[PDB]
Amino acid sequence: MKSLQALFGGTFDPVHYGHLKPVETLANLIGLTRVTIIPNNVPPHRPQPEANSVQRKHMLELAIADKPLFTLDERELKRNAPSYTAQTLKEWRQEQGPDVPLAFIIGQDSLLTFPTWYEYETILDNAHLIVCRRPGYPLEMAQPQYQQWLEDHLTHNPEDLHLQPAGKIYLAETPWFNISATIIRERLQNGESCEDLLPEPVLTYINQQGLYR
Amino acid sequence: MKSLQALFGGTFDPVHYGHLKPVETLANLIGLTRVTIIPNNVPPHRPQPEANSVQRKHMLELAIADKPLFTLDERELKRNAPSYTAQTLKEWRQEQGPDVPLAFIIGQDSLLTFPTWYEYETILDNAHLIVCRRPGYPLEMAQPQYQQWLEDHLTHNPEDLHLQPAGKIYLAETPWFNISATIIRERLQNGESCEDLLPEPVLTYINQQGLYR
Amino acid sequence: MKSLQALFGGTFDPVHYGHLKPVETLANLIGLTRVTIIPNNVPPHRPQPEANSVQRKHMLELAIADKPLFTLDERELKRNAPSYTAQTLKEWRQEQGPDVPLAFIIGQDSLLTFPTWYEYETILDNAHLIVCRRPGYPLEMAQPQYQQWLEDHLTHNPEDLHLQPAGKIYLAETPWFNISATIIRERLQNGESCEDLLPEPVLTYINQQGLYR
Ligand SMILES: NC(=O)c1ccc[n+]([C@@H]2O[C@H](COP(=O)([O-])OP(=O)(O)OC[C@H]3O[C@@H](n4cnc5c(N)ncnc54)[C@H](O)[C@@H]3O)[C@@H](O)[C@H]2O)c1
Ligand SMILES: NC(=O)c1ccc[n+]([C@@H]2O[C@H](COP(=O)([O-])OP(=O)(O)OC[C@H]3O[C@@H](n4cnc5c(N)ncnc54)[C@H](O)[C@@H]3O)[C@@H](O)[C@H]2O)c1
Numbered sequence A, B, C: 001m002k003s004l005q006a007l008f009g010g011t012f013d014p015v016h017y018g019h020l021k022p023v024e025t026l027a028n029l030i031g032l033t034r035v036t037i038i039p040n041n042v043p044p045h046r047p048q049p050e051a052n053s054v055q056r057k058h059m060l061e062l063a064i065a066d067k068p069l070f071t072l073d074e075r076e077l078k079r080n081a082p083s084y085t086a087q088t089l090k091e092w093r094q095e096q097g098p099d100v101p102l103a104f105i106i107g108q109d110s111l112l113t114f115p116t117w118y119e120y121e122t123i124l125d126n127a128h129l130i131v132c133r134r135p136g137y138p139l140e141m142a143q144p145q146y147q148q149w150l151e152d153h154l155t156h157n158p159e160d161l162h163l164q165p166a167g168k169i170y171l172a173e174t175p176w177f178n179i180s181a182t183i184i185r186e187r188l189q190n191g192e193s194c195e196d197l198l199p200e201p202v203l204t205y206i207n208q209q210g211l212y213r
């Protein structure tokens, strides 16, 4: 078993503390020396992002400039066809080999929607799922069958993440943040301060570019 | 519910690691993007501080120059008259509004003396109380009537701090530090090293100013 | 009880993230303002290091240059006679006084071998033992008698480390890392990347010196 690697996907419109901080602590809780962020272009499961692809990428770079834990993989931004996490993870698995523990990080709100993802069942064959807590979201799946799926792959010992290359779901004890890209976009539109919600470099870039206005 | 905001009050004569480190970790444990420190100007529950308001402010700015989590609120500092936490928190609630979760952070030794504070019962109407562990101090209130008050407001699920505006007392699992401003002043008096107890820039300022000797 | 101090010993051939990250997080979990790394030369319990004394020391200074938590103690590299942790801790105890809690940090793999150390029984008379988790290792001593010794000194309350000068063994809940110096040396020799396994500065020095590869 090689060193546990982690990937974190998202649209990040814009990237903010609710995306970053839970993950940074995750690295100290379970042991990650590197987290690859995988931004996407126009995900099917959601409306068009306000900031375009180039701007969202730049904001991510600005945000991790002084945080070596993070790096970017632009495969989904450059992909000509739409991307699917099941596909990106299949690829990562082939590239890294069968002995590299691999984990895909999501927030509690995305775990609730996981069973609706493209070929979701294949994801656990290629990687682990590490879920970060989000305040106020239900902890159990909406439907009984998907709750069973969850319990079927659930582990309470994060050590398991380092001992197998994939297959486990772990609900990490990460910090809570009542922060969303939506609230930030609206605060900016309303002329309310976002100073304590996302990196200064990102905020500054947002204002320089006139984004979300 | 907006983002949980935290306040950290004290005299800081001088600010040292026992003040800062528990709060820095607290931010990563429960989710704080900003902690506003509120230094007072000669409080009623203790004698005059040796360093004056200008010096303690300076030492705090030196201690947090590198720590973006922190910012200062000099409302009690620049005020010559006596200040009371209950009044400060009442003002904070009025200013921030009813939907902002607000927490006032204190150490275990301060929790034990909490029932003697000016109109202490109004504090939980305006904010939550986050208590940082301190080695050696009792965990239970001296008098049963106050242990009951503690028990009636306690929560073991820090997520509560993010879902209600105020009212809970949470005993956080923060790092322990056998450090106090008194030990620091006394060691300086005996010409014993205080390296490892507070920031070097703070110690430098102290010697430059001739403070505590 | 004065402030709890910690010592971290090892060969570090080379120092990597598996050595540092568990310890850095340890400082935030239990409360440590400083950890003194004690590198050794050619200890008898293991073969001769590939990298030499000055090289391993230089790699340590490079790795901690920007991590103020750490400092180096060169006594075991400068000592003429062979070094023994029991002796180094006896000296520390003598130098620090009887009221400083002292802790020596090791990984689970070393704890398993602890009963074979030179005068191992005297170590707990002089300091506490703090153990960092390591994935895949047995949690219990191989022989019942040493497991007895383990259980007899074991505490599940880390506050104990700050209230007594020595005597307890605490198994800290630190991050896991599938990293070893042996795998690094192999990889470098086979020309494979070691980018996410140890500090960039240390990798650079390794290349400059022609080490391992
Ligand atoms: N292949 C598919 O069918 C499919 C369907 C849906 C989503 N996805 C993937 O899931 C990933 C996340 O998509 P998204 O739309 O949620 O991205 P997003 O940009 O909204 O959020 C990024 C991540 O941060 C988490 N997060 C956001 N705010 C948080 C907060 N305040 N606290 C804690 N965590 C928080 C989200 O749950 C998500 O995992 C992407 O990689 C996306 O491609 C794939
Ligand atoms: N309004 C009132 O009647 C009243 C009465 C007492 C205190 N207070 C307020 O309570 C706050 C704390 O005052 P103080 O005199 O104790 O301030 P202080 O400067 O001594 O300490 C600041 C904070 O650090 C905590 N702390 C100190 N050393 C610590 C350590 N080693 N580990 C963990 N925590 C540690 C203290 O308990 C306190 O909450 C101030 O805002 C003060 O005004 C108000």
Ligand SMILES: NC(=O)c1ccc[n+]([C@@H]2O[C@H](COP(=O)([O-])OP(=O)(O)OC[C@H]3O[C@@H](n4cnc5c(N)ncnc54)[C@H](O)[C@@H]3O)[C@@H](O)[C@H]2O)c1
Residues within 6 Å of the ligand: C008, C009, C010, C011, C012, C013, C018, C019, C022, C038, C040, C043, C045, C046, C083, C084, C085, C086, C105, C106, C107, C108, C109, C110, C116, C117, C118, C132, C133, C134, C176, C177, C178, C179, C180
């Ligand atoms: N005095 C004696 O008789 C005696 C006998 C054996 C060892 N020792 C001492 O024990 C200390 C450790 O020696 P070593 O040979 O194991 O040093 P090392 O350089 O191999 O490792 C340094 C420390 O890091 C820990 N570690 C390494 N990889 C880790 C990982 N991936 N995750 C978590 N922890 C990890 C090790 O267990 C050890 O405590 C040294 O101070 C050595 O002198 C003393």
